[PDB]
Amino acid sequence: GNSKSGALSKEILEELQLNTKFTEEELSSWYQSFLKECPSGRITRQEFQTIYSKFFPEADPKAYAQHVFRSFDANSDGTLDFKEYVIALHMTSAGKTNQKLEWAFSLYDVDGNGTISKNEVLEIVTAIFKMISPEDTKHLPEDENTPEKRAEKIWGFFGKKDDDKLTEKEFIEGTLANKEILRLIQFEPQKVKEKLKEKKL
Ligand SMILES: [Ca+2]
Numbered sequence: 319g320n321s322k323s324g325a326l327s328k329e330i331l332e333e334l335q336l337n338t339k340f341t342e343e344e345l346s347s348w349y350q351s352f353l354k355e356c357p358s359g360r361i362t363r364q365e366f367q368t369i370y371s372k373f374f375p376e377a378d379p380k381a382y383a384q385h386v387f388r389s390f391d392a393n394s395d396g397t398l399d400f401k402e403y404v405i406a407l408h409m410t411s412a413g414k415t416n417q418k419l420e421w422a423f424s425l426y427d428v429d430g431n432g433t434i435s436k437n438e439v440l441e442i443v444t445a446i447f448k449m450i451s452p453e454d455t456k457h458l459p460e461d462e463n464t465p466e467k468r469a470e471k472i473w474g475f476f477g478k479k480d481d482d483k484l485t486e487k488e489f490i491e492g493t494l495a496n497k498e499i500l501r502l503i504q505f506e507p508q509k510v511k512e513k514l515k516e517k518k519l
Contacts, residue, residue, distance in 0.1 A: 324349060330401050337413045345404065352400055360397035363387045366406070374507065376451035385425060385445050386410060392430030410506055419493050423486045425505060433483035440469040442505075449507040450514070457514050468502050475499045 327345035370379035
């Protein structure tokens, strides 16, 4: 930790790699500031939720923030340490999606039982949908303009029956190969929005 706490930034860089938006020295600085506000270096789910409530005033981010917080162990109780908190912000707001597919699986596997069910896709798709301001949902395709439609389209693209289980192997294959699945599972609010106002006539 430099010798006086701080080498937690190495673990972060390792687990995030090129995806990092920070050097270890900057992470330590953010960490020093983090500790002035959260002395224990831990952050609860309620506190994490507040971050998103504050920075997404146009949306209803509570469910979304809770699922993101849980992705780091499928637990609503407890806390996230600085490392998981930095990685969580990166997953929702920075970098490329294709480097986040393994984490995306953990996000979609709500109960953490190793596979994704149809209902879990709907729960997450709904949470992400609520991150879109009412103003933008009108630019959304007819067959992708409600949580139900989006979630069923994703399930259909995976060629699944109502009670089938979706594995990580297939989730990664499909999110990489089929760009429509990518578009529909997309969890970064800005990316959903920016594609939600582009394309072609
Ligand atoms: Ca599951």
